[PDB]
Amino acid sequence: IGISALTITPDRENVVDFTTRYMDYSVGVLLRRAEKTVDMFACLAPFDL
Amino acid sequence: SLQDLSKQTEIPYGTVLDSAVYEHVRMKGLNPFERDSMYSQMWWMINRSNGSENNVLESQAGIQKVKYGNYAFVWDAAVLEYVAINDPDCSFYTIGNTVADRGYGIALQHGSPYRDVFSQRILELQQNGDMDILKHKWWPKNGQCDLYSSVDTKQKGGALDIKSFAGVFCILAAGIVLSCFIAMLETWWNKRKGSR
Amino acid sequence: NGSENNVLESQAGIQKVKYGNYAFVWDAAVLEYVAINDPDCSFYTIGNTVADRGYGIALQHGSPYRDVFSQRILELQQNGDMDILKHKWWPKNGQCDL
Amino acid sequence: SLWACIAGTVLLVGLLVYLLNWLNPPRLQMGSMTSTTLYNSMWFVYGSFVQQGGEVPYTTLATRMMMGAWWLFALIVISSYTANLAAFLTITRIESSIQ
Amino acid sequence: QQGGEVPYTTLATRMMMGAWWLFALIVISSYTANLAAFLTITRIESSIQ
């Protein structure tokens, strides 16, 4: 038996006989959240402190 | 979305060299008979300087280059989510496409006898829904922070409001305070000046 | 003669960047060290995924001890113990968003 | 709500000025149009805020400073109003790209 | 914005003057704001490439 994040691909189905899949494979992207833009002194910020 | 990632070019993105995802993008981008052209753009993000420019060598690198830097990383979504949930700052968030047909499955030797029994039982465990209870063990339903909201903007009409403006009201309140205290201290010292 | 826009030393290049209309090319590790240990964050630096090279110990050819230090370096790397001595000079939460 | 806060501010400021000038009146001519008549005091505290009203005669240091601060508050308010209007006008262009 | 001591004591006059003053101060703000936007539209977004 062999088991991991193993993905069914046709070129491998030529030498090993995968079972029915137990979950779908999905491509994703990682990002960093936008922090926060508002502060109490934004009306004074046009001049340096 | 990945479309909205692929349209812009002001944040660069890439993937680990010779990975399955790398060769899958290379395959998609070169095929002119492809229906969705997006990959043929993304490849020109990934191929830059013959593929030396935006690609990291090892899978730990990209996570840090993202967190400490101006980059994005393309990998297995079910892994990226498992990092994103467990970043202690909840500073990550992650997005991904509804790919299908390809999927995870147990391998077997050629002509092994087990194949039918397992293929039956995996289906029966999916129809029970047990494969969800045995899955919410690992990607839990919700944490302290939402999985995907990049910012809870609340601003939509662009107006100013009391909470954002009141820093100016503090200036007037300070003026009222100081001027009143000046009046009070003058009126008290009028007990002691000897002239008024 | 390869000499006019080139510079006598790495310090000469760094200073010609900070105090002049110039840019300087050097080991990206050193240039990020300069860029973060420059307290102004006045520099920034950029580079490439150069490959097939790395900083290493060299020994007498045929040394009987090469394998011991190679083993201990592989221990220090695969444990991550090297990461402490790297962070000692390149901390990840650096001052400057280069 | 912010329009309401702005509108309500002036009546407080004018009341405070009226009371302070009543309690410490100037050593000047009584009962003139510059004196502590309430409606004139409010009219001054309004007309100064819109820039229009011209100079305000009150001499006593506390209310003098108070009006100097009311002025320096107002000058920010106009700038904020103009700035955010210009922002709204520069923004409002894009949604026809819904496709 | 040339001010002056507008002489009137009556409520109706002062009300009318307040209305006119506020009208003027909104108008000048609108003019300046739209002129700002009109100039800010200056971009090479016009290029066809």
User: How is chain A classified by DSSP, letter by letter?
Assistant: -B-SS-B--TTTTTTS-----SEE--EEEEEE-------TTTTTTTS--
Q: CA end-to-end span of chain B, whole Å?
A: 75
Quote the distance between the C-alpha of residue B109 and its chain's center. 40
As given in the structure block, the two tokens for residue C65 are 């001890």
Q: How far apart are CA A12 and CA A34, in angstroms?
A: 42
Closest-CA residue of chain D to B183: D62
* Angle at B170 (CA atoms; ends B190, D24), nearest 5 degrees: 20
Q: Does C92 touch chain B (CB under 8 A)?
A: yes
**Do the beta carbons of residue D48 and residue D67 sit within 8 Å?**
yes
State how far the Cα of E36 lies from the Cα of B127, in Å rounded to an integer: 63
- In degrees, to the nearest 5, what angle opens at C-alpha E47 toward C-alphas B10 and B38? 45
Resolution in Å, one decimal, please: 3.7
Residue B91 marked ligand-binding: yes
* Residue B107 DSSP symbol: B
The first and second tokens of residue D3, run together, are 């329009």
In sequence order, the 6+-apart residues with CB closer than 8 A to the CB of B143 are: B85, B90
Long-range contacts of B183-191 (CB under 8 A, 24+ apart): B183/D20, B183/D23, B183/D24, B183/D62, B186/D24, B186/D61, B186/D62, B187/D23, B187/D24
Interface contact flag, E37 D81, Cβ < 8 Å: no
Q: Assess D6–E contact: CB distance below 8 Å, yes or no.
A: no
Residue C10 annotated as binding? no
Phi/psi for C17 (5° steps) reads -70, -50
Contact residues on chain D for E40, CB-CB shorter than 8 A:
86, 90
Whether the Cβ atoms of residue B130 and residue A46 lie closer than 8 Å to each other: no
Is A13 touching B (CB cutoff 8 A)?
A: no
| 3-state SS class at C64 | coil
Specify which residues B76 forms β-bridges with. A27
What pairing do the DSSP bridges indicate for beta strands B103-104 and A23-24?
antiparallel
Chain A environment of B112 (Cβ under 8 Å):
17
Q: How far apart are CA B84 and CA A32, in angstroms?
A: 10
- B61: which 2 tokens? 């690198």
Token pair of D89, please? Answer: 């006008």
Residues in chain E after which the backbone breaks (C–N beyond 2.5 Å): none
- Do residues D49 and D74 lie in contact, with contact meaning Cβ atoms separated by under 8 Å? yes
Contacts within 8 Å (CB) and 24+ apart, A1-5:
A1/B106, A1/B107, A1/B108, A1/B114, A2/B106, A2/B107, A2/B108, A3/B106, A3/B107, A5/B76, A5/B79, A5/B104
Q: In this complex, do B187 and D76 lie within 8 Å of one another by their Cβ atoms?
A: no
Token code pair at residue B24: 């899958």
Residue environment code for A11-29, b if the CB has 16+ CB neighbours within 10 A, otherwise e: eeeeeebbbbbbeebbbbb
Q: Would you list the DSSP string of D3-71?
A: HHHHHHHHHHHHHHHHHHHHHS--SS-TTSTTSS-HHHHHHHHHHHHTSTT-------HHHHHHHHHHH
CB of D3 less than 8 A from some CB of B: no
Question: Are B123 and A20 contacting, i.e. CB atoms less than 8 angstroms apart?
Answer: yes
Residue D86, Cβ neighbours under 10 Å: how many? Answer: 19
CA torsion sign for B85, B86, B92, B98 is negative
Hey, how many other C-beta atoms are within 10 angstroms of the C-beta on B106?
A: 20
**Rounded Cα distance, B165 and B168, in Å:** 6
Sign of the alpha-carbon dihedral angle for B5, B9, B15, B19: positive
Find the Cα–Cα–Cα–Cα dihedral A15, A18, A23, A29, rounded to 10°: 0
Q: Is C49 within 8 Å of B64 when comparing Cβ atoms?
A: no
Q: Give the integer Cα–Cα distance in Å for A38 and B161.
A: 11
The CA distance from C10 to C28, in Å, is 12
Distance between CA B181 and CA B169 in Å, rounded?
18
Going from the C-alpha of B134 to that of each of A36, B119, B140, the distances in angstroms are 37, 18, 10
Q: What angle do CA E16, E19, E20 make, to 5 degrees?
A: 90
Unique residue bearing structure tokens 């030396």? B52
Q: Is B14 helix (H, G, I), strand (E, B) or coil?
A: strand
Dump strand ranges (E) for B77-170: 92-96, 103-104
φ and ψ of D66, to 5 deg: -55, -45
Residue that has been written with the tokens 């109706």 in this structure: E12
Number of Cβ within a 10 Å radius of residue B107: 18
Residue D55 has, within 13 A of its CA and on its CB side, a CA count of 3
User: Tokens 């500073």 map to which residue?
Assistant: B91
